[PDB]
Design a protein around this nucleic acid. Structure first.
Ligand SMILES: [Mg+2]
Ligand SMILES: [Mg+2]
Ligand SMILES: [Mg+2]
Ligand SMILES: [Mg+2]
Ligand SMILES: [Mg+2]
Ligand SMILES: [Mg+2]
Ligand SMILES: [Mg+2]
Ligand SMILES: [Mg+2]
Ligand SMILES: [Mg+2]
Ligand SMILES: [Mg+2]
Ligand SMILES: [Mg+2]
Ligand SMILES: [Mg+2]
Ligand SMILES: [Mg+2]
Ligand SMILES: [Mg+2]
Ligand SMILES: [Mg+2]
Ligand SMILES: [Mg+2]
Ligand SMILES: [Mg+2]
Ligand SMILES: [Mg+2]
Ligand SMILES: [Mg+2]
Ligand SMILES: [Mg+2]
Ligand SMILES: [Mg+2]
Ligand SMILES: [Mg+2]
Ligand SMILES: [Mg+2]
Ligand SMILES: [Mg+2]
Ligand SMILES: [Mg+2]
Ligand SMILES: [Mg+2]
Ligand SMILES: [Mg+2]
Ligand SMILES: [Mg+2]
Ligand SMILES: [Zn+2]
Lengths: 127, 155, 24, 80, 60, 118, 98
RNA sequence: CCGGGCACUCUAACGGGACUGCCCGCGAAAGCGGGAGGAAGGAGGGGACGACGUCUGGUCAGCAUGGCCCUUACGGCCUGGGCGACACACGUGCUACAAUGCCCACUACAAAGCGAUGCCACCCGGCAACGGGGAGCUAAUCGCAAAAAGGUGGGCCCAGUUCGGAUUGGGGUCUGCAACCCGACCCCAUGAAGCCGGAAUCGCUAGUAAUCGCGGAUCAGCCAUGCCGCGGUGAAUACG
């Protein structure tokens, strides 16, 4: 009937709700391509369905909030793959060599006192 | 890298051609962290090269990069006072970085107005064996075979 | 650019409003 | 670009002093430490010693200079 | 600073604009945090001592 | 096409070709193209003399312009310079007026760097 | 409507205070909604480490105001019976609005 | 938005979780190489944390303090001026020299904070800074608020320009007893140098550099381009 995964990337979450359907994807009450599309990276979110050839099987409804859009895409990528494994746990062995089910733990490195931006040091003269 | 080998960064396959060399080229185009703009430059240049020439831009991009790969270059080495321009080979990883960076830095030296026009035109010339990028490659291998007299300093 | 105060961009750089960057 | 927007400000020190000097006719030099104030038309023709911080400088006030402030005519620094 | 310059305490300042911060503990003129009423130095000295409730070390 | 005192912008859009008038920036050009009912995008070479004569009517006598402006500015300097004004003293010695610092970076107002010894 | 606003600098004094209130109101009142945790207000202060510069050595401190909500639904007496003055915690502070 | 529900996102407290524990190889061992499982592996990433001591380092001008001087005065009050001076020199930054760009309209996705005489939605006047009116908020419930780069559409067509916003004339708002020395902000006009920088030299090894905005501390106001934080997009390269 329905399968779910959460997915997260860089202070951004996007809950993926999978239902068997024509292949049409809604994101925040907008068309998938009316939200994205002006962004070349957008197709990455959907790569889990091409790894299992789940293209024409599922419809998806997503709720994406937080962060910027490019991180929103990666969270959708995971949430899609998470709902995919809960659907058929035999897809773990399929999806895992690609890493689609791993979380990207890289977040903005905090700024540190004495530097300009958290690594970049102020330039000096000595003379 | 004093300690380790400092392994290579593994680039993500191209979103379009599934090709890592594409992404690596797109990155050299990207400035100020705009990967979105850099792709739209590259892909809108793929339409120029495929219309103004009835040939697949995939094989031309490959063929252009190959013609700019230097087989040898010159390096300095501190010897007996002032140093020397010493010829030696180019590891195949460095042939990649140079030829890619050379294509991009050449295209921006071009006369054409819009970005993707310069890229596609430079690419088209580079595969054909001409254009500014192939001159940097043909000029480097001219440094070697010129200072060839120091081929015993190989290091 | 960010220097011209009679452009929208030079208005957001100073953090002010005017004819070249109204509120709503 | 200069702005007081209304109630063009003048110090109460000289104001009550000058308006009384009109009713008795133009007087000689006047001591003033308040250059904060603007100039008003009823100063024209007078002589006012404005403080630069060190001395009192005689300033003949005329019709052309009605808009400004005192001390615009009594500079502070001294260069070369 | 000087005991005379703790005249801000007695302000009756004749102009509100002449009210200035004046760290209370040490009589510092310049850098006075307003929520504590201390100066940046008296703030660190009282924080370490533990006399400022809720004020811990900052780490993240 | 001569609108103000002798002034001949050409071949470009009309609003932008008005910038080439002294007393006209982008705010005055957009205003004249608005109040004279002219498309700002039309090329200067494609301007109707009936539109051009309407433009000359407007701009010539609405605001003080090119010739008079230069004299009005200078006579507005001599004004504060002839009186003992402080602002006038700075205009004499070629220094900033709006209250900037001169210890460095006075370059635009004054005499690109003339160096001495130490 | 019975609102109870718990605020304190220590996060163990609020919890020591909030749990005690649910246990006195769950013997009488309906299912109390629960100890719902509200976000924290974090005031930060950054101070140069010494006097008289060495500008680039500052160490910062933070003062965190933790918040909690209570919301007993329809409490009458044996709720308010144990709620007059039985609480221990000190760094805690409470308000009531209806 | 209501009814209603806690599952989800979240919030903020308690826990679990990774240990070379499992497999192969080497090794005497410690461990090194590689592999599966796993959100994560050999210090997962980032902080706070800086030993015996060194430099007679820095500060008696934050405070404390030994000695020495001053005592109608080195002290005390005020107004005014100065800390902003300008023939030059260095440091650190900001904005740029443009088309991977500038401008205009339209439209989309943050994290972290601040606010009771303050934050001020919203309405009216004003080109606008802003003024009047006035709602809500002791604030996950209201407000700062619009995030910007981005996307779609359109304009400029390589030019000291629709690049660049210095300088200067002119009109005006606000704070403040008061803006001459000496403030910020708005509107009109002016539209400078500058077409990627000599010798030399600086930063960073991954969410890093680069770039884009946002907030805060002090503060009536502000010369904040500073500083301390926040997230958005997101590289190149390391033979040695
Ligand atoms: Mg950043
Ligand atoms: Mg610094
Ligand atoms: Mg230093
Ligand atoms: Mg501009
Ligand atoms: Mg001299
Ligand atoms: Mg003392
Ligand atoms: Mg003050
Ligand atoms: Mg000159
Ligand atoms: Mg000259
Ligand atoms: Mg000369
Ligand atoms: Mg000497
Ligand atoms: Mg500092
Ligand atoms: Mg760790
Ligand atoms: Mg650690
Ligand atoms: Mg010493
Ligand atoms: Mg100073
Ligand atoms: Mg209006
Ligand atoms: Mg709430
Ligand atoms: Mg709510
Ligand atoms: Mg609440
Ligand atoms: Mg366009
Ligand atoms: Mg020039
Ligand atoms: Mg221009
Ligand atoms: Mg040019
Ligand atoms: Mg390092
Ligand atoms: Mg402020
Ligand atoms: Mg200034
Ligand atoms: Mg700021
Ligand atoms: Zn103090």
């Amino acid at each position: 009937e329905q399968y779910y995964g959460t997915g997260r990337r860089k202070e951004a979450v996007a809950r993926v709700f999978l239902r068997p359907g024509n292949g049409k994807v809604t994101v925040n009450g907008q068309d998938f391509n009316e939200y994205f599309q002006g962004l070349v990276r957008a197709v990455a979110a959907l790569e889990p369905l091409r790894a299992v050839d789940a293209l024409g099987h599922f419809d998806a409804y997503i709720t994406v909030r937080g962060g910027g859009k490019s991180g929103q895409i990666d969270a959708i990528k995971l949430g899609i793959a998470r709902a995919l494994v809960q659907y058929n746990p035999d897809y773990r062995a399929k999806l895992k060599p690609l890493g689609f089910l791993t979380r990207d733990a890289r977040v903005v490195e905090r700024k540190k006192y004495g530097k300009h931006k958290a690594r970049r040091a102020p330039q000096y003269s000595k003379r | 890298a004093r300690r380790r080998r400092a392994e290579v960064r593994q680039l993500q396959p191209d979103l379009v051609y599934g090709d890592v060399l594409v992404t690596a080229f797109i990155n050299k185009i990207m400035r100020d962290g705009k990967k979105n703009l850099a792709a739209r430059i590259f892909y809108d240049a793929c339409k120029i090269i495929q219309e103004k020439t009835g040939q697949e831009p995939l094989k031309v991009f490959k063929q252009a990069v190959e013609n700019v790969k230097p087989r040898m270059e010159v390096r300095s080495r501190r010897v007996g006072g002032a140093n020397y321009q010493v010829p030696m080979e180019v590891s195949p990883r460095r042939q990649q970085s140079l030829a890619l960076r050379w294509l991009v830095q050449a295209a921006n030296q071009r006369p054409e107005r819009r970005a993707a026009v310069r890229i596609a035109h430079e690419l088209m010339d580079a595969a054909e064996g001409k254009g500014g990028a192939v001159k940097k490659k043909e000029d480097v291998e001219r440094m070697a075979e010129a200072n060839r007299a120091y081929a015993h300093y190989r290091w | 650019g960010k220097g011209d105060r009679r452009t929208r961009r030079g208005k957001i750089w100073r953090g002010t409003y005017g004819k070249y960057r109204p509120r709503k | 670009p200069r702005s007081l927007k209304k109630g063009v400000f003048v110090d109460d020190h000289l104001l009550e002093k000058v308006l009384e000097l009109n009713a008795k006719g133009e007087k000689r030099l006047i001591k003033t430490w308040s250059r904060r104030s603007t100039i008003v038309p009823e100063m024209v023709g007078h002589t006012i010693a404005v403080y630069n911080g060190k001395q009192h400088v005689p300033v003949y006030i005329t019709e052309n200079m009605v808009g400004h402030k005192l001390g615009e005519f009594a500079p502070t620094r001294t260069y070369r | 600073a000087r005991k005379a310059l703790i005249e801000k305490a007695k302000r009756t300042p004749k102009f509100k604009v002449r009210a200035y911060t004046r760290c209370v503990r040490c009589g510092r003129a310049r850098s006075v945090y307003r929520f504590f009423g201390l100066c940046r130095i008296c703030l660190r000295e009282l924080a370490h001592k533990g006399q400022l409730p809720g004020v811990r070390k900052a780490s993240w | 096409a001569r609108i103000a005192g002798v002034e001949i912008p050409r071949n470009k859009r009309v609003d932008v070709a008005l910038t080439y008038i002294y007393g006209i920036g982008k705010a005055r050009a957009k205003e004249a193209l608005e109040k004279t009912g002219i498309n700002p995008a039309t090329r200067v070479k494609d301007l109707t003399e009936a539109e051009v004569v309407r433009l000359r009517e407007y701009v010539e006598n609405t605001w003080k312009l090119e010739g008079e402006l230069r004299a009005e500015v200078a006579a507005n300097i001599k004004r504060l310079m002839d009186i003992g004004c402080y602002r006038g003293l700075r205009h004499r010695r070629g220094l900033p007026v709006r209250g900037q610092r001169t210890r460095t970076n006075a370059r635009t107002r004054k005499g690109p760097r003339k160096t001495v010894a130490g | 409507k019975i609102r109870i606003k718990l605020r304190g600098f220590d996060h163990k004094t609020l919890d020591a205070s909030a749990q005690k209130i649910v246990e006195a109101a769950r013997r009488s009142g309906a299912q109390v909604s629960g100890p719902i945790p509200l976000p924290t207000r974090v005031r930060r202060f950054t101070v140069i480490r010494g006097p008289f510069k060495h500008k680039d050595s500052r160490e910062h401190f933070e003062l965190r105001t933790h918040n909690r909500l209570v919301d007993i639904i329809n409490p009458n007496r044996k709720t308010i019976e144990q709620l007059m003055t039985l609480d221990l915690p000190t760094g805690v502070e409470i308000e009531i609005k209806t």
